[PDB]
Symmetry: D2
């Protein structure tokens, strides 16, 4: 089979990517930071689709050595064709008060892990000589700021820039690199008038685009940030309800 | 369900019609050029067990020419998907371009999509079941050509209309996006492009199909660029 | 003296660009599509700064022939160094109901005028061989939509595209082409909580940037859309007034 | 006088910002991470304009403690009205071979410094209650990649995001936050549409404009000064 690895997987977007790719016949790897039972839970659901599931701890508290877990996971699965760098929870902190270690921790978890995992995956894809795909889950805040989450905004921008740089630098290896940039996604209702579509997105509505990016139809798409946001990016003071 | 491709061609238009026919959409086609290509596409659509209906929609006769889309919607019974396909690129140096040439490029490249989108959106509102409008633009929605100022300006216009329709039609659950191709190989190495080849028509049509899927229900107001890395390239590349 | 021409001038941004450029030593041309008396008042104020002012009518209801008034104005000023294509009033019309003639009229007034004026100015700049500047007044709606003004949004996008295309195509002539994209401008503090800076902009706050774009300091700037908007573009659904 | 401080100053854009703001009558603070002699040359030229010049080392190899040099510089000048976070040199490393230490060094020098300096300046501006300006010198690579400088590209994007976040978060204090994004600056070229490198004064001139009252409605933007670099696609 092709092999897809979802890094920093969670019960939301990351789990939904794992399951939809398992249903497409990919063997799946999962990395986890602290939530081993959630990773084991997803792995059991993946195995129910008749593909392989392998998990490993990738400790974002112990970079860069901690990232060598992905090498071991690739060795166990035999190859890698797809890396999906899933986004962790949003950490907020007021700009004026934010401790330097909190600024650094948000970059460590939200960019540095994706950097190290992307480099390991890309080195394996070059070794195989069969191309590959790297898909970074970012946010609308790759593009437009939060008013109370400056580190989170800056790190999403950083992962956007890394996405473009990897796309250009790795294109020669036929490694396609893109971001999927979610808006406000419900992780299980009243209308949400602040969003043009007037609801939160579903995890499936992000994972579906990841699946398309893993299809042969996506073979001309690289260097892009594909925004799935219910119109969040269209909102401005002439729309925003008072 | 019904998908209509306006200003269809033997490239992206045909491949959208065929992939949507295979998802079980009845197909409408309008043509401004290559009627025989539209008829060939309709014959191949019918081989997939769905309906194919075609009309001329003459972009040299706007606005009255656009009423052909009302006739096509009447014949197919409804519309769920509109794909506004893009015509050929016309180049013309800026300093000496005739005003009529400038206006003709806006007529063909945005006025047609405007009128088709209004007719489709009215029908989708009447149905009450939402809909999808997909505008085929260009990388030149975003970045210029050095010798095609009218084409560039009209692609940008269609990108702005995409955003405006997306926001204005959103409470009717009509999702509006652009697919922005780079250099595509059509019936009608490239070291300059990072992937070092032209795109295939199926690599545009594939994304149009995804935008017609339930998985795309949260996607609106966007311009999805399918360009082999064209947008990444600069004088440092 | 260098010459700056402000096309489709008004008592707002266009007037303030004329007055601030007169104060930087530019002879001024003004074209008017509306408000003839305002154009004459601007001219009288410009001449107080010790430079020339010339005005013509340029009727956007008579394109293309009406644009030839700009050739007469350039002749009368002897040269052109700067063209400022000023933006007219925004027209709102619902998308589903909009008449096709309404759609086309917005493109005529908001893109086609700037196209023909830019061609005439660029031809003269090329013949002079001394470079030039074309500055298009667009809008934040070059970039983000209105909810009820699809034609205005599309036409501002079009003028943004034309800005980039002219910048690339005219670069060998050292003709620098940019857009200044205003937000909500008064034509005050804490009166507008929907905007992050909590007020409308002043005409001076647009014209000041136009003045900078006409300075030698701006000689490396081309192809850009410089947004002056009190943070309008930042006001996503998570902005709290 | 109003006070402008140039952080991570150099003999190019940083010096020219200091000189052109001194001409407008700003007292000047200079921090240096490299080229101490250049910071002293800048100060010498600044005082010719009849304003104060104060210099400190701000060591980006010693963060976060090193950033407290900016608190000392503000104390010496009495206030701050303008912070210009100047950009250091571009560092390249191939993506597949890049060490984690190289990635981290580039984020330390190209983002973390600007973050800590911006926080210190913004706190002072809030304490004063008189508004202020923060101007980040980024790059065209805030927007478009290098093909062989992925860390530099990511870090410039990061600083672009921080610029937007600070613009929105600090707006109630009337602290205006923008980036100036240079192309290729000299400190004929047929790869660049205008066929030359930019001059340091063609960047500093825009920074001076952003420090004027006419710029009082500009916040959250990245103003690209690049000779058309961004327009040059595979069709140029
Ligand atoms: Ca379970
Ligand atoms: Ca016929
Ligand atoms: Ca000149
Ligand atoms: Ca102040």
């Amino acid at each position: 089979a092709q092999v897809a690895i979802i890094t920093a997987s969670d019960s939301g977007i990351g789990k939904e990517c794992a399951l939809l790719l398992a249903q497409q016949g990919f063997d799946i790897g999962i990395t986890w930071h602290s939530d081993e039972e959630g990773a084991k839970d997803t792995a059991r659901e993946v195995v129910s689709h008749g593909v392989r599931a392998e998990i490993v701890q990738l400790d974002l508290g112990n970079l860069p050595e901690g990232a060598l877990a992905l090498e071991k996971l690739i060795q166990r699965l035999g190859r890698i064709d797809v890396l999906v760098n899933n986004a962790g929870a949003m950490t907020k902190a007021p700009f004026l008060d934010m401790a330097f270690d909190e600024w650094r921790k948000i970059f460590t978890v939200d960019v540095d892990g994706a950097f190290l995992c992307s480099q390991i995956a890309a080195r394996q894809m070059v070794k195989q000589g069969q191309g590959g795909r790297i898909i970074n889950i970012t946010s609308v805040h790759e593009h437009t700021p939060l008013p109370d989450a400056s580190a989170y905004t800056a790190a999403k921008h950083a992962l956007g820039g890394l996405t473009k740089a990897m796309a250009l630098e790795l294109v020669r290896h036929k490694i396609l690199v893109n971001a999927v940039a979610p808006g406000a996604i419900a992780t299980p209702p009243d209308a949400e008038p602040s969003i043009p579509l007037r609801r939160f997105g579903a995890t499936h509505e992000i994972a579906s685009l990841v699946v398309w990016l893993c299809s042969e139809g996506a073979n001309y798409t690289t260097g892009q940030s594909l925004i799935v946001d219910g119109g969040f990016m269209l909102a401005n003071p002439q729309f925003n309800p008072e």
